[PDB]
Every structure is written in structure tokens, then in C-alpha cells.
Design a protein around this ligand. Structure first.
Ligand SMILES: Cc1cc2nc3c(=O)[nH]c(=O)nc-3n(C[C@H](O)[C@H](O)[C@H](O)COP(=O)(O)OP(=O)(O)OC[C@H]3O[C@@H](n4cnc5c(N)ncnc54)[C@H](O)[C@@H]3O)c2cc1C
Ligand SMILES: Cc1cc2nc3c(=O)[nH]c(=O)nc-3n(C[C@H](O)[C@H](O)[C@H](O)COP(=O)(O)OP(=O)(O)OC[C@H]3O[C@@H](n4cnc5c(N)ncnc54)[C@H](O)[C@@H]3O)c2cc1C
Ligand SMILES: Cc1cc2nc3c(=O)[nH]c(=O)nc-3n(C[C@H](O)[C@H](O)[C@H](O)COP(=O)(O)O)c2cc1C
Ligand SMILES: Cc1cc2nc3c(=O)[nH]c(=O)nc-3n(C[C@H](O)[C@H](O)[C@H](O)COP(=O)(O)O)c2cc1C
Ligand code: FES
Ligand code: FES
Ligand SMILES: [Cl-]
Ligand SMILES: [Cl-]
Ligand SMILES: [Cl-]
Ligand SMILES: [Cl-]
Lengths: 306, 262, 306, 262
């Protein structure tokens, strides 16, 4: 239909995708609506081994946003291949799944990328490079173009599905990293991951988060997301799934004006569990309001804008 | 068939203790309520505050289609403060009811039930006692507060039959001076089931004194986000299964004492 | 009193300072209250020559924030020495003024720093290094530690008043830049300047701002500000004037927990013209609530926290 | 002595045209109002929307202590939309009145005044005509709209004596089909003062047809932030003084035609 969009590895009925780490592996939000309404799902990060994650408190509220520092808690590859992904395949066999892949060192990233494409419902791997690198001094794989390009090319060597890369906003210049990752064979990009923030408790005078720092998400970060998506779209020809503060069909369309081809929705699910289906159903009315016939056309019109 | 979310109507709301408001909510969510100790996930009426506020259900009335909550507010920058400005007739955005509550099915008239509450952990224990009274069992209820200034629900608990009620205050402004844990140490019978909810130091004291009790139910609190088990914000370590994380919002808020570490 | 705080060049009756670019040169907000209530004022940026600034639209609203791209509009050094600063000296001779200094090339920065200290009410120069450098490819003087250290040391050579440096949050790692600038002789720091954001108009499909990108300010950016202030405070021994999203006495104290010694207030003035005096008067009540006797003590307790 | 800011009370509010609301505000700010064409800087009742909304004063009543505004709302994500949900009795956070208005002191009974309005530029022109009627001068008032669906204040203007009122709509749904500028071209007298407010293309047409008139007053709009002249958000180039910036909020919103470029 009008909402349908086609991306490498993804023939989506609509462009609305719950963002990784905000939907689990679907089992809880499924209690609230038929997940088939979604275009896709970015499931919680997969690491090679299980991770309990960071100590609590893990979250904090901010003005039009939140902080989070769960630390990529997940049951690990085996359990995700055996339990989490099969449950989604059984209950929603036609719903394509984007597997968010994280790690502490390159070998770990590669091992997950070799295996997780085997799951039939997994159509795309989302490479999360905002992770501290224990072979590089704790350096997030995504702040250095050469590190990032190496990681991408290595994982590209073993993926049986198209490989997207999730870019971090915490850089002086995102253009070198984006260029390098496309050159290393990335089929697409997703952006953005969280900003870094801190809250202090006035009584204890200590940080609210046990991790001290946390990732800043929510509508507060949408202007930064649009800036970086727009910046990157002028510099690469692979498509972009945009995210950061999306809350409404208006926000979705604004993501398109920036150069995104589909839109992920994260923090909004916590305020409103129905936000993703609500956005999906109000998209055609809102597209009418601004004279947009189809999302596929809008992508090409904007791509030629240019 | 379940409603999951509802714009409820606040029936009334009044300050019943220093910075503690009692709100009555009317909606179809009340028909889905069963176990005491479930909670509601409340949206603050302020668009810059996106995380819902988790608040225990204190009591409900299925015929009236009403539930009752009692919550403490923060300063003028807090969201609970904003909630307290809502007036009779306003709508409030509720998700719920949520979580594993206090089980009561296996309580029988023979059993002697102990209840230990503190501070703003007290509200959910009211609906608990209300339900246990029908099972014709004999309860002792020990409640502690920082001050007379924040005592809540004394009268409601007192009007319950089969109830011995003792009340402590840390400063001595009312009832027994000191903490609930002291009144615990004075217990002189064999309790078959203990239900407790309150500040961590109190929950810890209860959990040691009755570490050997199996029917020991502890209601936990945590920072929360999604409120349904998706986001992993509210994890406790599983005591009986290291290498496993309990989620307060979805596995709890009520746990067996053997599932918890301190 | 309790609110009094002493910094290099600044004996402040309280730590509340309207942020540069949000107070003009005081003449408009003076219509609403006695500016003597303020601790200080960061006046609009001074460049060597006049600047009309960027085309309109210059501002846009965001979730718990705003975007702005005025482009450092100011009447230039001569007019600011002859009109703007003297008016503040006449009407508020005891109110110390922080002169925000910007420029396109180093010589321009130096020339302003040589002259503006002559004004009697100017007690501190705030070096704004978030400016595009036309001798370096448009590179903001504040993203490269060596560029920044050179600029600071050059301006340090001619300043008759203590020199503070305003740091930009748009960097991968703010610690090298902060270290280098302290080493070059900076008496203090102020942080943060704005993040970068973009909004799109859904009807025109073009950016709302004529400049496309704009600076993102307001409560939305407070978690980022606290993170960077906290990060920098562990790495330098010169004091920090913290700013970013401050709206309340609570926010002021939270800035102190992060390591600030005084707090600037920017975007909040546009929503509430009285916000700075309101914060000043509710600070003692709020300090009581969290058992803080004086702001000077709190600074030392936090500095030893450490 | 001046109030500067006030939590006014909305007396009433009703949708008088498609997505256009008329609000009556009661407060002490009304006593400070003088020239037509000043504005109010309205805080949206949504804490995530921090910039005030600038809205023209359409009329006031010093005895009633009320002023009247007419504003168009956006979609459900807009702040004006939020403002329209405010009900009779609610408070609204107003700064004002602000800006340089339309001058009327030098208008005298001999003069023939022309008024050209369009869209949501029309409201401030009502208080203008209301004041000029006392000076016993003869006015022609030309108002244009996109459609009958958004026509406003026809009846109020019609009930004014010494007023010829012609109304255009771009689609022809009401009155004359076309734009106001057309009805301008048909003017058959020597106008001594022209007051105009509306969409940029219209303001441009008026400014060329009467470029040689000196008493030509043009009410401008702009994106705004501080609303008082501090932040430099709302600058126009000064036509008579290149190398100088006019600020719509503080120098305006009303300017002499010689001060403006198109
Ligand atoms: C399962 C559960 C049931 C609860 N039942 C009750 C009850 O019946 N009565 C009652 O008064 N309180 C109850 N609480 C605590 C209540 O949720 C917090 O006091 C409240 O959320 C604080 O928010 P605020 O608006 O006052 O402060 P703000 O500082 O504006 O809140 C900032 C963020 O921190 C969170 N937060 C801060 N402190 C706490 C805390 N102690 N617990 C959880 N979240 C916190 C808030 O939810 C919000 O996300 C319960 C908590 C949980 C987890
Ligand atoms: C001096 C002056 C007087 C005005 N008088 C009136 C009046 O009497 N009636 C009326 O309907 N409108 C008037 N306007 C226009 C009115 O301020 C805007 O239509 C309104 O601010 C749009 O906000 P929103 O909440 O609908 O949209 P949102 O998209 O939620 O607003 C986003 C931001 O953009 C700003 N903005 C967007 N469009 C405009 C615009 N066209 N003009 C100014 N700011 C804009 C908003 O103020 C806000 O800061 C006036 C504008 C000015 C400058
Ligand atoms: C609780 C939480 C957990 C997250 N977990 C992950 C993750 O595991 N992997 C990942 O790539 N991004 C993760 N993110 C980032 C989001 O997917 C998204 O990139 C970011 O939050 C911005 O989108 P939003 O503002 O719509 O939430 C997480 C965000 C939150 C709030
Ligand atoms: C309209 C506007 C103009 C500004 N102008 C300047 C400036 O000229 N020089 C400067 O160093 N910072 C400037 N800033 C940044 C603010 O001083 C402050 O560093 C930033 O806005 C964050 O603080 P806030 O969130 O409290 O506004 C400006 C900000 C705004 C919104
Ligand atoms: S709050 Fe999200 S998992 Fe408990
Ligand atoms: S709005 Fe700030 S100067 Fe006009
Ligand atoms: Cl791992
Ligand atoms: Cl009923
Ligand atoms: Cl210059
Ligand atoms: Cl009256």
C-alpha cells in the first residue's frame, strides 16, 4: 500500500519498527496488540554470551526524555537462537526481524553474525557499534572509522543476511564513520543510538544511575537525530532507518524529510504501549494533510531533493 | 477481552497526610483486579515527564467500579506533585493492573497471618487484609512510620475484625517509639504466612527474622520504565537461580523470600 | 551570604548568571526587574566587527527545548565598548559583567580580548570557541585541543581580566580539549554551549531554520550538560560555570553535584522572564530541603567527593 | 507599576471558524492596553513546549477587564491546539501587552482610512477600526480569506458605522472571488493612511501599490522566542538604514512602509 516500503532484506507492510532494547523480543508487547501490525522489530541486543547487565538503578527520567544504562542485558546467542527467535517465528512467521548484534571484541561480533542469520525470521542484522572495545582501550567501535570499517568487513564476511550498522551520535564528525562503513560493505544504516547523560540525586549527591552515565533517548533527542540523519544522507547512497524521539506520524514524516526510509520507535513505547499501531493507523490521514501519496515516492522525491 | 489501559476518572482526591494523597479512580480496569498487591502505571499530566509512575492499588470496589491509591508526592518539580493537582472529574492515563500480587487462595481460617508494613509500602496491604478477613483468619498487623505526620490508613485497618493492630513511629509522635522491626522481635506465636511491604531496611529485617519461613511474601520497589517486562529496568538477582534476573514489574512486585537477596 | 560564591574575577552575591545570547546586554530584561538581583551577566557575544547574523527563520521549538541559529548578531566591539557596556556600568555599576568573545580567526579573538577588559564593569572574558575557523577549513576552534590551546594562550597574552573558556558538547571526547585549555592558562571554564539539531517543515519538506542546522538548548540538554560537566570536573582544577537546561533551584543544585561553582541560565528566560530572580529567592528553601548550609561549602564538599 | 505578566482567566473560548478559536481573557493586563496592534506572548499548557505563542490582541474592554483574541490552531501536535483545550475558568500564562501598535492619535475626521486584512492578520484590525470610529473618520475595510470556511469577524466589522466593508475569498465561496489585492486595485479615492496585516504576499502587494504613501502601517509576523527584543530571533532588515536590524517583537510588530523591504 502507501505505507509499504522495500529495503535490503525487508519488504515491509509499513515502516514502523520498535527500536532495539525497547521491545524485548516481543513477548510482552504482544499481550497488547497483534505484532503483525508492525513492519518489523529490532529485538534486544544479542551478545555471544549471556549478560546480566549493569546494576540498578538503571533508568531515570529527564525533560522529554529518559536515561538508561541496562548494559545490554540479554540471554546470549544460544538461548536467543533456541527460544527468543523461534517464539517470534512460530507466533509471527511473516514478521521480519532485525537482530541487533553487540559485542566486546571483534571475534564476538563475528561469531554472532555467522550464526544468527540461520534463524528463518531474521532478515537483517543491525550491527551495534556503540560498544566498548576491550582490544582498543574501551573505545566504542563506532567512534573510529578504521576500527568500524574493519568490524563491518569482518562481520560482512559471515552474514547470510544484509548487514545494517547503527551509528552513535557521540562523535565530533559522523561523516567519516558513515562513509567508511558503507565502503566496508554495509547494506544500510540505522541512526541514531543514544546520547550520553547524567542525573544527580540531590539528597545523596551521587548519580541516579549506578553506571553514573546513561543513554539519553526520547523526543528530547529528535532534533539531534534529524541533524545527523540529514547530514549522513548527503554522503551515502545506502538507505537509513531513522530513530530518536519518534512519537507521532508527524515525527515519522519528518524522519523522511531528513532522508530516512523507515522509522524505528523506542522510548515512546514506555509511555504508550499502543504508540506503534496508533502511528501506523494515523499515517495515511497525516500524509493526506501534507499531500504525500506514498512513502516509497516520498523517499525518491527526497533522495532527488537531493 | 482485558482492557490493559484506560483513561480513568478521578472520583476524588484529598491530602490525607503530609504530602500523601488518596485518589479514587473509576473505570473498567477495576473489573480485572484480583490479587492484592498489583499496581497501576500512571502517566503524569506533564508532557515533559514521559515515564509512568508505578503506584500500588490500595483497595477496590468492584460494584462501585472504583479503586483507591495512596501516594506520596515530591517537590514542585516532581511528577507525583503534578498528579496531585488533578481535580475531581479529571481523567488520568492508567495502564493496569500489573504484576504478580499477594496470593491469598491457600490461606485458611486456622492460619495466623502476620503483616508488616512501613511508610508508603502500607497502601497495598489494606486490600490484602480486606481479603484475608473473609477467610476468617486471625491477623496481626504491624505498621511503622517516620512520624505521626505521615501515618496513613490506621482507621481503615482498625475497622477490620480479626485484626490486632500495633503502630510505631520512629520519633514516638504516635503509638510505639521506634521501627516496626522492634514490634516484630516481640512476636509470640508461630506465623504461617507473612506479607510485608516497605522500605528496604525493613524488608531486610523481616527477611532475616523469618528466613526459614516459606510462605513469606515480600513486595519490592524499583525504578521502572516500560512497566511490563520488556525494557529490563527493574531487575533483581534471583537468589535461588544465580545466572537469572527477576523483573520487579512482571515477576513481582511480590516475591517469595527465598527468591530474594536481602 | 549562603548564596555568595567567589570565582576568579567574580565576587558574586549569588551564582545565577543569565547565559550569553539569552539576555542581550540587559536592556530589555531590566524592564522586568532590578538586574542587581543577578550575580552576574553573560552578555551577547562580541565580535570585532558588526554582524547582522543569519537569515530568518532563526528559531524553532523542540520537545523541552529550542533550536537557534542567529549567527552571533552583535553591533561589534566599538559599539559594545561605547554603548552597551557603559549603559550597564551606569545603571548597574556594581554588577560584574562577563563578556562573551567570539571570532572567525585568531587575530579577531585577540583584538577583542585586548580591548574589552578596559570596560570597568567587565570582570571576566568568556572565550566562545564554538566558532568556525576560516584559517582551518571551517573547524570550530573548540574541537581540536591544539587549535584551542593556541587560541587561549594568544588571548591570554592580552587580557587584563581572567579568561574563561566556553566548551562545546559536540565532541567525541571533551577531556583533551579541557586539559589543553587549562594548560594554556584558562582561569576557568563554562559549559556547555548548544548541541546541534534540525527541524523539518512537513509542508515545504525543507528545514525550518534558514541555516538548516541550529543550536539545541533547554531542559532537553541538561542530562548531556551534567554528564560533560561531571566528566570535566574530574580532570581540571579550575572552576566551572555550568549551564544547559537550567530552570529551577533544583537544577542549580544538581549543577553543583556535577562540579559547577556557579550556574548560567539561558533558554528559561524566554518562557519565564522572572526565572532568574525566582530561582535566586527559592534557592535557600531548596537548600534547606537537602541540608546544604552554603553554596561555598557545597563546592568544597563536592570537590573533595571528589 | 506595569504588570508585564499575568495568569489571566479565560472567560470563554469557542470555535468561530474552521480551526479558529475566539478566547476572552480577563485580567489586569487589559488596563495597560492602548494602541491597537499590540500582542500577547502565550505559554502553551504543555511543559515540553517552552516558547510562548505570539497572538494579536483583537479587541478589549477596559471596564470588563477583558481582552479578546482570535487564533488559528495547528494539528494535534501543535501548541495552539493545546491552548484550545483550555476551558472557561482556566488560567493562561500571559506576558504583555507587547510591541509597537498601530498609531491613531494623528487620525482626524477629515481623513479617509483604508484597511487591508487577510487570514489571521485580521483580528488586530478590529480594535483598530473600533478606535478609529470614535475619530469620526470614514473607513473602507477590505478583508480576504482562503475560504468561507475561515472567514472571521465579518459581523463585528459590519456593525461599525462609517465603514464600507468588502470581503473576498480565494475560492469564491463568499463575497468576491479572488484575493484582497484585487479589491485594492479598484480603490477610487485618495487614502491618507493605510493599515494592513496579513500574509506576506498580500503585505507585498499593498506596499507596492502605496509605496509613495507615508502613513502606511504594516503589521509583521515572525518566528519569536524571548518576545521582548533580547534574543534577536525576529529580525527584519531596516530598509531606510542598511547595516541595521529591526526586531519585529519590539520595534514592531507594526512598521512604516518605508522601514520595510517587500
Ligand atoms: C511496584 C511499585 C509500587 C509502588 N507503590 C507506591 C504507593 O502505593 N504509594 C507510593 O507513594 N509510592 C509507591 N511507589 C513509589 C513511587 O512509584 C515513587 O515514589 C514515585 O514514582 C516517585 O516519583 P515522583 O514523581 O515523586 O518523583 P520524580 O523525581 O519526578 O521521578 C523521577 C523518576 O524516578 C522514579 N522514581 C523516583 N523514586 C522512586 C521510587 N522510590 N520508586 C520507584 N520509582 C521512583 C519516578 O517514577 C520517575 O520515573 C511504588 C513503586 C513501585 C516500583
Ligand atoms: C506579532 C504576531 C502576532 C500574531 N497574531 C496572531 C493572531 O492574532 N492570530 C493567529 O492565529 N496567529 C497569530 N500569529 C501567528 C501565531 O503566533 C502562529 O500561528 C502560532 O505561533 C503557531 O504556533 P502553533 O502552536 O500553531 O504551531 P507549532 O508548530 O506547535 O509551533 C512551533 C513553533 O513555531 C512557531 N511558529 C510557527 N508558525 C508560526 C507563524 N506563522 N508565526 C509565528 N510563529 C510561528 C510557534 O510559535 C512555535 O514557537 C501572530 C504571530 C506574530 C509574530
Ligand atoms: C532501555 C533501552 C534499551 C536500549 N537497548 C538498546 C540495545 O540493546 N541495542 C541498541 O542498539 N540500542 C538500544 N537502545 C537505543 C534505542 O534503540 C534507540 O536507538 C534510542 O533509544 C533512540 O530512540 P528513541 O528515542 O525512540 O528511544 C536502547 C534504548 C533504551 C531506552
Ligand atoms: C538565542 C540564543 C543565543 C545564544 N547566543 C550565544 C552567544 O552569542 N554566545 C555563546 O557563547 N552562547 C550562546 N548561546 C548558548 C547559551 O548561552 C547556552 O550556552 C546554551 O543555550 C545552553 O543553555 P540553556 O539551555 O540554559 O539555554 C545562545 C543560546 C540561545 C538559545
Ligand atoms: S519496567 Fe521494563 S522490565 Fe520492569
Ligand atoms: S523575539 Fe527575541 S528579539 Fe524578537
Ligand atoms: Cl558476550
Ligand atoms: Cl457503578
Ligand atoms: Cl567579526
Ligand atoms: Cl470588572
Amino acid at each position: 500500500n502507501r505505507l509499504s516500503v522495500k529495503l535490503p532484506g525487508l519488504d515491509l507492510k509499513n515502516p514502523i519498527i520498535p527500536a532495539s532494547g525497547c521491545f524485548g523480543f516481543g513477548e510482552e508487547y504482544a499481550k497488547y496488540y497483534d505484532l503483525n501490525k508492525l513492519g518489523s522489530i529490532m529485538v534486544k541486543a544479542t551478545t555471544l554470551h549471556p549478560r546480566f547487565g549493569n546494576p540498578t538503578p538503571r533508568v531515570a527520567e529527564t525533560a522529554s526524555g529518559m536515561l538508561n544504562a541496562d548494559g545490554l542485558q540479554n540471554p546470549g546467542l544460544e538461548v536467543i537462537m533456541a527460544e527468543k527467535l523461534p517464539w517470534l517465528n512460530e507466533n509471527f512467521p511473516d514478521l521480519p526481524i532485525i537482530a541487533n548484534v553487540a559485542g566486546s571484541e571483534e571475534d564476538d561480533y563475528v561469531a554472532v553474525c555467522a550464526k544468527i542469520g540461520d534463524a528463518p525470521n531474521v532478515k537483517v542484522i543491525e550491527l551495534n557499534i556503540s560498544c566498548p572495545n576491550v582490544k582498543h582501550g574501551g573505545q566504542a567501535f563506532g567512534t573510529d572509522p578504521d576500527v568500524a570499517a574493519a568490524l563491518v568487513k569482518a562481520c560482512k564476511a559471515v552474514s547470510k543476511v544484509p548487514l545494517y550498522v547503527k551509528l552513535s551520535p557521540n562523535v565530533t564528525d559522523i561523516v567519516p564513520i558513515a562513509k567508511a562503513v558503507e565502503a566496508a560493505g554495509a547494506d544500510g544504516l540505522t541512526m541514531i543510538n543514544t546520547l550520553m547523560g547524567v542525573r544527580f540525586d540531590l539528597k545523596t549527591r551521587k548519580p541516579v544511575l549506578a553506571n553514573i552515565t546513561g543513554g539519553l533517548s526520547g523526543p528530547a533527542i529528535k532534533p539531534v537525530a534529524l541533524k545527523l540523519i540529514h547530514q549522513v544522507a548527503q554522503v551515502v547512497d545506502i538507505p537509513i532507518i531513522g530513530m530518536g524521539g519518534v512519537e507521532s506520524a508527524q515525527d515519522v514524516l519528518e524522519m523522511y524529510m531528513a532522508g530516512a526510509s523507515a522509522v524505528a520507535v523506542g522510548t515512546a513505547n514506555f509511555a504508550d504501549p499502543f504508540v506503534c499501531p496508533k502511528i501506523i493507523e494515523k499515517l495515511p490521514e497525516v500524509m493526506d494533510q501534507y499531500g504525500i501519496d506514498s512513502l516509497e515516492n516520498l523517499i525518491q522525491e527526497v533522495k532527488n531533493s537531493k | 477481552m482485558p482492557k490493559l489501559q484506560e483513561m480513568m476518572t478521578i472520583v476524588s482526591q484529598r491530602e490525607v497526610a503530609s504530602n500523601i494523597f488518596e485518589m479514587v479512580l473509576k473505570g473498567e480496569l477495576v473489573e480485572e483486579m484480583d490479587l492484592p498487591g498489583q499496581f497501576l502505571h500512571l502517566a503524569v499530566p506533564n508532557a515533559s515527564m514521559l515515564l509512568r509512575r508505578p503506584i500500588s492499588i490500595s483497595s477496590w470496589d468492584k460494584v462501585a467500579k472504583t479503586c483507591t491509591i495512596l501516594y506520596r508526592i515530591g517537590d514542585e518539580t516532581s511528577g507525583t506533585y503534578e498528579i496531585s493537582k488533578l481535580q475531581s472529574g479529571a481523567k488520568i492515563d492508567v495502564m493496569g493492573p500489573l504484576g504478580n500480587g499477594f496470593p491469598v487462595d491457600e490461606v485458611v481460617s486456622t492460619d495466623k497471618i502476620l503483616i508488616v508494613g512501613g511508610g508508603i509500602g502500607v497502601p497495598p496491604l489494606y486490600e490484602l487484609a480486606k481479603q484475608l478477613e473473609e477467610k476468617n483468619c486471625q491477623m496481626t498487623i504491624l505498621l511503622g512510620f517516620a512520624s505521626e505526620k505521615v501515618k496513613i490508613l490506621e482507621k481503615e485497618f482498625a475497622e477490620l475484625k480479626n485484626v490486632s493492630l500495633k503502630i510505631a513511629t520512629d520519633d514516638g509522635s504516635y503509638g510505639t517509639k521506634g521501627h516496626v522491626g522492634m514490634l516484630m522481635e516481640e512476636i509470640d506465636f508461630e506465623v504461617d504466612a507473612l506479607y510485608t511491604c516497605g522500605a528496604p531496611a525493613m524488608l531486610k529485617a523481616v527477611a532475616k527474622k523469618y528466613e526459614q519461613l516459606e510462605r513469606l511474601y515480600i513486595s519490592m520497589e524499583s525504578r521502572m520504565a516500560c512497566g511490563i517486562g520488556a525494557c529490563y529496568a527493574c531487575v533483581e538477582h534471583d537468589k535461588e537461580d544465580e545466572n537469572h534476573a527477576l523483573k520487579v514489574c512482571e515477576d513481582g512486585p511480590v516475591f517469595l523470600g527465598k527468591q530474594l537477596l536481602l
